[PDB]
C-alpha cells in the first residue's frame, strides 16, 4: 500500500501506550508512504479489507477487526499487529521480498 | 568371565529349600501377608507423601490465584469507578 | 397452518430453562446480573462489560440444567 | 474455501468430519453451542453480521443461528423440538 | 555339554538370557528396563504397518490418516496403540531413569552414559514422529522448536532453513521427519545392545546396593516369567489405555488441518518433552533457555561425578530420600506449569520449580550426602 | 477477551464406560445434517457406505 502522507500524519500522530499492541509507527515502515504487510489478520485468519476501517486502514468483516493505515489492530478482537515481510528496494522502480 | 563356577567364595552356610509343589502357592496370606503390605506402607507413607501434598497446595493455589487474575475481571471495571 | 401445535410444541428446552432460574443460585446470580446491567447504563462510556457475571450466572445456570434435561427427551 | 468465505462474510465454515473430536470439550461444546444463542449483554456491541453465541471463543460466531423448532419433519415421526435436533446432529457427528 | 553351550548362536542367547546370573533380591522396578525392549517391538512392528499406509505430503498425510483411521481394516486400534505406545514408553523411561537415580546405579558410569545417549535418540524419535500427523498442533510445535535452532549465534537461521528444506515447514520437512523417525529407532536398538553390552559384564545392581555375589540366581526360571508378568501389566495398561479412553492423553484440536495461516490459542507440546518446555518459557532471553534446555538433560552425566555418600542405595539414607521425592514432586511442578498459559502465577512458580530443579541436583544433594556421611561417623 | 464459558456435561447414553451410540438418533441426526447441515457443511472423510 503506497499511500498519501496524510495517513502518514494520523498514523505518527497515536499514541503509542493506547495500542493494543504498541509499536511505533515510524519504526516500522522504511518508508513512510509505503506500507507492506502480510494479508492475513493475526486473529483467525480471515483476509482483512483494504482500504476501509475507520482509520482508514484495514478492516476485517469475519470479527469486524478494525485496522489501521500501517497496519496495527485497534479496535477489534485481534490480539497483535498485521506482520511485516522482510523487504528490500533496489532499483527504485523495483522492491525485493523474502 | 563371571560365570557361577567362579565367584564369591563363602565357607559353610547351609541352606534349605522345598519343592514347589510340595507347597502352596499362596502360604498364610492374611495372617502374615497383609500386615506386611500394611507395615511396608507405613514405613513409605511419611517419607513419601508429604513433598505431593506440598505439590496440591500449590496446585489448587495456582489454579486459583490464576482464577482472581483473570475471572475477578469485575474487579478491574470496579476500579474504573 | 395452526398456530397451536406450534404453540403446542413449546419445546422442553426452556421449560427446563427456566425452572433452574427459579432456583437461588441462578437468582442471586439473575439479580447481580441485573445490577451490573443498571451500572453500565449509568455512565455515557463505559469500559465495564457484564458479560462476566453473565458467565458466572450461565455457569451455574446451565450446570443446573444438565441434570434435568435428557431425563425429558428419550 | 474462498467461494465459501464469499458467501460467509470471509468466515469459513469448517468441515464437520472431525469437528467434534477436534475441540476441547468435544462434542459437549457442540450441543451448548446450538442450544445457547443468548441475546447480547449490556455494554459490549458488535457487528450486524456477527452474532452472539457466549460458548464461542471469541463470543461473536458468524454462524446464523441454524435451527430453530420445526426446521424440519423426521421419517421416524418423533417430535422436532430444537433440543431433540441439536441432540440428535451431536450423536450422529458423534459417530462421524 | 548342552547343545546351547556348543552352538556360537546359542552361547549368546545362553549368557544373554538363559544363565547370566542376577542379584535375588531384585524387586519391580528393574523389570521396566526390559518393558522398554518390549515397547520399542512394540513401537516398531505396530508403527511399520502405519507406514504402509501413511503419505509424507503437505497435502496427503492428513488424509492418509483419515484412511488409516477408517477406510484400513483396524488402522485405528493401531494408531491408537502407536501413538499411546509412545507414551507408555516414556512412563517405562522416565521410571527406569528414576530407579537408576534412586538404586546408585549411575556408578556404572559408561551404560550410563550411552543411556543418555539413547534418551536423547529417544526424544528426537517421538519429536520427528509427532510432526508426521501434520494437525494442527504438528505445525506449529515443529515451527516452534526448529525456530529454537534459530538462537544459535552465528548458524542461527541459516541452520534451521538446511533442517526445514526451505524458508519454512512444508512437504519436504515433513518426508524428512517421515524418514528419520523412520530410521532412529533402528539405531536405538543398536545402541540398546551396547547398553546391556555395557551392563552384562559387571553384573546388575541390587536394591540394597551390596554386592550380591553369594546370592545370584539363573535369570530364567524366575526372570522370564517375572518379566512376563510385567509384559501382560504392561498390555493391561495399553490395552485398556487406548480401548476405553484414547484421546484423554492426546491433545484435542489437534485434528484440525494445519493452517500456517493461524496459530492454535493454546499451543503445547505433548506432555513428556513437555517439562523441559519450562524451562524455556521460564528462562528470560532465546539462547539462556536453550543452553538451560540442554543442561537439563546433559546434567545427568554429570550426576555420577557429584556422588559423594560412601554409600551407594538411597534406601538406607532417607535425608536424601526426602530430596528425591522433593525433586519428583518438583518435576510434577514443571509439568503441570507447562500445561498451562504464560501468566505471572505460572511464570513464578516455574522460576522457581526451575532453580530448585537444578539447586537440588547440584547443592543440596552432596552436602546431605556429606552430612550423612558424618552422622555415621565416616 | 476473557476465556469462554465452560460447557456443562450432560448425561449422554454413549458416555457410559461400556454403553453404546443409539443408531436411531444417529439416522435422525444425518437426517438433519442432509438439509440444514449439508447446504454449508462438508464431509470430506465420509462415504455414503
Ligand atoms: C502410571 C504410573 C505407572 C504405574 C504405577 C507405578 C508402577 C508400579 C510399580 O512398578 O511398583 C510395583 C511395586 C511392587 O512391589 P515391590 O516389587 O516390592 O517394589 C519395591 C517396593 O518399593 C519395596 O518398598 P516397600 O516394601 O517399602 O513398599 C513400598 C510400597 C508398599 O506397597 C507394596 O509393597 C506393594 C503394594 C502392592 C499391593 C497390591 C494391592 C492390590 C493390587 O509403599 C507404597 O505403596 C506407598 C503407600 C501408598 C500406596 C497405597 C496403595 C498400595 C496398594 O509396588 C510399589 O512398590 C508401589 C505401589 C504403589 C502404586 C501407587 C499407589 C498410589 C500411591
Ligand atoms: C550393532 C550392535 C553393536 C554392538 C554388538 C553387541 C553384541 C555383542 C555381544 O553380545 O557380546 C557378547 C558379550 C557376552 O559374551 P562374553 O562371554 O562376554 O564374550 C564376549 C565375546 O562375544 C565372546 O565371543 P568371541 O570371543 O568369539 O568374540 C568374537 C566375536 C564376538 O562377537 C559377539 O560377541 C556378538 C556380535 C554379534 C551379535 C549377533 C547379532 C544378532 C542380531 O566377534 C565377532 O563375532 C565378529 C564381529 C561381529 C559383530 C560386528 C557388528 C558390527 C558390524 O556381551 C554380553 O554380555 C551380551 C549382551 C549384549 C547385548 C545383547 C542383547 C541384545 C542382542
Ligand atoms: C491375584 C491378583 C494379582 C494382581 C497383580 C499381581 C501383582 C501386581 C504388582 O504390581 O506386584 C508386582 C509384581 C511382581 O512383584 P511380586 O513378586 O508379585 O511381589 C513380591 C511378592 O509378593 C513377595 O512378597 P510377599 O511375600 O510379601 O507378597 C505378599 C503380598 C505382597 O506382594 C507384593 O509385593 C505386591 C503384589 C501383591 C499382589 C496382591 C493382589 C491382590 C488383589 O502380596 C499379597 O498377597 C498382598 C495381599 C493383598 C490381599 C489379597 C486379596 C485382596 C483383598 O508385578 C510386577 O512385576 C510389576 C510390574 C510393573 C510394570 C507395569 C507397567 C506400568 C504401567
Ligand atoms: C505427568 C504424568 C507422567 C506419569 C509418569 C509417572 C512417574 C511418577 C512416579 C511417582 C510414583 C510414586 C510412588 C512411589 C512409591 C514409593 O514411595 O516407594 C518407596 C520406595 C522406598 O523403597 P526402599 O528404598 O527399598 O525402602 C524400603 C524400606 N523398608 O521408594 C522407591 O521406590 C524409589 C525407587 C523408585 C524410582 C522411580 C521414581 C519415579 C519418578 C520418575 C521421575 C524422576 C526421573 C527424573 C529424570 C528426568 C530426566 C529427563
Ligand atoms: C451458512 C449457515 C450455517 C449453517 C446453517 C450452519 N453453519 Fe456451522 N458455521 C457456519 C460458519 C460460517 C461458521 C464459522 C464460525 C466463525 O468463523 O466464527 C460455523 C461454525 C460451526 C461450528 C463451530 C466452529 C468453531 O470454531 O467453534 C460448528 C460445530 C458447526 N459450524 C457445525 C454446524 C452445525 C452442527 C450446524 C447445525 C445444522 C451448522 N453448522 C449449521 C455456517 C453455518
Ligand atoms: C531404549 C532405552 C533403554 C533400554 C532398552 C534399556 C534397557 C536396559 C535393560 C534391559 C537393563 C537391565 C536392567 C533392567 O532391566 O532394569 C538396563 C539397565 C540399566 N540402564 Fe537402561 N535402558 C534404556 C534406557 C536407559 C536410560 C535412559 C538410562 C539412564 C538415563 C539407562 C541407564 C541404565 C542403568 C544405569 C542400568 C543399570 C541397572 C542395574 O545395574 O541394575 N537406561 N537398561
Ligand atoms: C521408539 C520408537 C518410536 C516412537 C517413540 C514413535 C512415536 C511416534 C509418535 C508419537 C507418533 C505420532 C502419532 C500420533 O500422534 O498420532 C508416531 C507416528 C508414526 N510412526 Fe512412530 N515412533 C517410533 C518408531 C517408529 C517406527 C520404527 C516406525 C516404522 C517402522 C514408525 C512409523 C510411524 C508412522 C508411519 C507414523 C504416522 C502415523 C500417525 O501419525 O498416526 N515409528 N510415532
Ligand atoms: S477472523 Fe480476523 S477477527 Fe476473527
Redesign the interface.
Known sequence: RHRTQKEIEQEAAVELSQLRDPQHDLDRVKKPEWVILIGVCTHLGCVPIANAGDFGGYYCPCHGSHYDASGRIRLGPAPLNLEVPTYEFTSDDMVIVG | GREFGNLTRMRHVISYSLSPFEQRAYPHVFTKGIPNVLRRIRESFFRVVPQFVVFYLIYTWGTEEFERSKRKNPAAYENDK | EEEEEEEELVDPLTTVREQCEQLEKCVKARERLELCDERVSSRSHTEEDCTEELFDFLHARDHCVAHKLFNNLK | SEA??A????????????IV??????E??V??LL??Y?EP????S??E??YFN???????I?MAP??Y????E???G????????A?????????? | TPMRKTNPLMKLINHSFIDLPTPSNISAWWNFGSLLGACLILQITTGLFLAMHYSPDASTAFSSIAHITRDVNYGWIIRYLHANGASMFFICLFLHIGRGLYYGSFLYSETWNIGIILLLATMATAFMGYVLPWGQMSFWGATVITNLLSAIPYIGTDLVQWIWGGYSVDSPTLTRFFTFHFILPFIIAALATLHLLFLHETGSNNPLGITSHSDKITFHPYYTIKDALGLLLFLLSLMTLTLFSPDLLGDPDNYTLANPLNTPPHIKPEWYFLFAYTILRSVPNKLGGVLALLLSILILAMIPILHMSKQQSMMFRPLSQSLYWLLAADLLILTWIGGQPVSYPFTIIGQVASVLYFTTILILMPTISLIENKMLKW | SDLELHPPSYPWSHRGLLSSLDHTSIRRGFQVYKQVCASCHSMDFVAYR
Request: proline share 10%; hydrophobic share 35%.
Open positions: 465459501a468465505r458467501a460467509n462474510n470471509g468466515a469459513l465454515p469448517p468441515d464437520l468430519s472431525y473430536r477436534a475441540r476441547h470439550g468435544g459437549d461444546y450441543f451448548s442450544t445457547g443468548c449483554p449490556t455494554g459490549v458488535l457487528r453480521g456477527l457466549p460458548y464461542f471463543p471469541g463470543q461473536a458468524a441454524p435451527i423448532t420445526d426446521v424440519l423426521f421419517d421416524d418423533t417430535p422436532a423440538t430444537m433440543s431433540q435436533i441432540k440428535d446432529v451431536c450423536t450422529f457427528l458423534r459417530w462421524a
